[PDB]
Write an enzyme that holds these catalytic residues in place. Structure first.
Site, short mmCIF file in Angstrom:
data_model
loop_
_atom_site.label_atom_id
_atom_site.label_comp_id
_atom_site.label_asym_id
_atom_site.label_seq_id
_atom_site.Cartn_x
_atom_site.Cartn_y
_atom_site.Cartn_z
N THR A 46 0.83 -1.21 0.00
CA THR A 46 0.00 0.00 0.00
C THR A 46 0.86 1.26 0.00
OG1 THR A 46 -1.57 -1.29 1.30
CG2 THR A 46 -1.97 1.06 1.13
N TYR A 110 -12.88 -3.82 -2.21
CA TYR A 110 -14.01 -3.38 -3.03
C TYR A 110 -15.12 -4.43 -3.22
CZ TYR A 110 -16.61 -1.22 -6.97
OH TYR A 110 -17.59 -0.71 -7.81
N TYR A 136 -2.91 -10.10 4.99
CA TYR A 136 -2.84 -8.67 5.23
C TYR A 136 -4.27 -8.15 5.38
CZ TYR A 136 -1.87 -3.70 4.14
OH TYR A 136 -1.79 -2.33 4.06
N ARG A 141 -9.43 0.07 4.41
CA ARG A 141 -9.14 0.24 2.99
C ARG A 141 -9.84 -0.78 2.10
NH1 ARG A 141 -4.91 3.52 1.39
NH2 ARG A 141 -3.82 4.60 3.11
N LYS A 165 -0.47 -9.61 8.73
CA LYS A 165 -0.23 -8.21 9.03
C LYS A 165 -1.56 -7.55 9.38
CE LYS A 165 1.05 -3.84 6.57
NZ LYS A 165 1.40 -3.32 5.27
#
Ligand SMILES: [Mg+2]
Ligand SMILES: [Mg+2]
Ligand SMILES: [Mg+2]
Ligand SMILES: [Mg+2]
Ligand SMILES: [Mg+2]
Lengths: 297, 296
Positions: A46, A110, A136, A141, A165
């Site tokens: 990211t 999304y 992750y 996000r 993560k």
């Protein structure tokens, strides 16, 4: 048991010059990370603006990271994830082909897969390569959450999946994870709470702040791993103001701003839709930086 | 401004043996045309844009354009990306292949600032000469296009004519049309279709219309004629199906319902999407039995 990649890691910014990846700046930044005690580097996560890079630019960033870490103990944990499983499998295979020691694979963004879908997503990725895979989770996000149960099942069912993560500001979940599966590698993806995560038994960080202050993040993590929690907390507390101001706008907008203010990159360039911070937040980043000692090259 | 409004459908994308069922796709669009729908949105969220190749994206838009020619029905092509350069190229591609306008989702995952969103959409609008509808769905993207940004974009960019809102926020719908009454506010949330229309919204981009296109078309048309009593009646009758169609992430339920109605041949998704739970499958089946579902 499993092959792992842990310790102090940096989610590398990707510097741009006249709209192109500055490949010299990139290799130079990575060298600076190696020389300040970092254990692994994360190209094109990211913080590296993975979304706006072409596939060849992705290959270039990963290859430079591999080439720069040769002859050192520092490993390359390649950002390689996507919200399409077929693509994430391809990106994983490619990262391995280009010499990455492991992959960081973001949960699909999304399209909000269910837990069953997330399980099949990561199982397909993990079956496609023989190098370690770090999940992750960043729900703010992606719009989805890999649940504790899903994470634990993936860790137990897939040999190369070895931890997660977490960037979810949820210390309860961190307790939940390691209380039910103490063998996994929980990795902090949220700098301000690096110490709380490590002190509950997390085994590393993938850091934004270490782009600017790699020696401080390295020392924090290593103290913690040495069970010198007193010194790890001291650094964690000192880093709080910069850890927080580096998110006054969407990462990596503040960290690139700070790197530019410190003279570590030549141009304050992003790829749209990312852009320069407001004048007020620019000024705030410069103010917070004042009390930290920033290493040069 | 040039606009695309009215009753619109976010087309599902049917798969068979792992590939886009191109004949099914054309047949589904014909069924939308025949049931009063004013526009079709190929390759949006509900059409699983994220897991289609660039070639399949092209095929889907081309089938939509070709099936709608010789009718009023307009093609509002899904064409957005969290990378501005790619969203511009997708916009150019949609226009060059005959779409009447584009629906462009706010950048997902990388969370641009309001300045970033302004520059993103300004770039896209300047690249084509066909209408552009913004698409705000913060629960999926992680960002929110603020009212001020939406209004600024509408006033500064000729092609930008309104926004599809999928944010559960009727306060924001009021804010938008009270300060900028010329924009086309489009419902992206089936359950609150009528509240958005009755506040001055000019259309819907519906999930439920895949299954019940005649009901959503009537609802919209009653409402646009200010026949609010009739539009609210359909909105109220549709609430149970509108809600059960999100018992799992869209489009997992709507595809499950289309399959149960015999409207698509196979209950296939592309990973990371997949079949619903057994319980939710049963619940979708039960709610459907309250509604008259038009065949072909
Ligand atoms: Mg990406
Ligand atoms: Mg993709
Ligand atoms: Mg009339
Ligand atoms: Mg009347
Ligand atoms: Mg009802």
């Amino acid at each position: 048991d499993k092959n792992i990649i842990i310790g102090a890691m940096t989610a590398l910014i990707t510097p741009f010059k006249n709209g192109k990846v500055d490949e010299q700046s990139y290799a130079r930044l990575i060298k600076r990370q190696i020389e300040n005690g970092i254990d692994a580097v994360v190209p094109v996560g990211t913080t590296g603006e993975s979304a706006t890079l072409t596939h060849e630019e992705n290959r270039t960033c990963i290859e430079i990271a591999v080439e720069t870490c040769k002859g050192t103990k520092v490993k390359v944990l390649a950002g390689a994830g996507s919200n399409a499983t077929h693509e994430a499998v391809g990106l994983a295979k490619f990262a391995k082909e280009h010499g990455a020691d492991g992959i960081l694979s973001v949960a699909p963004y999304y399209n909000k897969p269910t837990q069953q879908g997330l399980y099949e997503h990561y199982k397909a990725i993990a079956q496609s390569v023989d190098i370690p895979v770090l999940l992750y989770n960043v729900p703010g996000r992606t719009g989805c959450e890999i649940s504790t149960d899903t994470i634990i099942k993936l860790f137990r069912d897939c040999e190369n999946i070895y931890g997660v993560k977490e960037a979810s500001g949820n210390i309860d979940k961190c307790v939940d994870l390691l209380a039910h599966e103490p063998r996994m590698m929980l990795i902090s993806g949220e700098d301000a709470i690096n110490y709380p995560i490590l002190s509950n038994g997390g085994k590393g960080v993938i850091s934004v702040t270490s782009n600017l202050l790699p020696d401080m993040i390295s020392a924090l993590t290593h103290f913690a791993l040495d069970e010198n929690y007193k010194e790890a907390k001291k650094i964690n507390d000192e880093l709080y103001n910069i850890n927080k101001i580096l998110f006054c706008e969407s990462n990596p907008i503040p960290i690139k701003t700070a790197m530019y203010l410190a003279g570590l990159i030549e141009s304050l360039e992003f790829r749209l839709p990312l852009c320069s911070p407001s004048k007020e937040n620019f000024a705030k980043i410069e103010e917070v930086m004042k009390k930290y000692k920033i290493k040069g090259f």
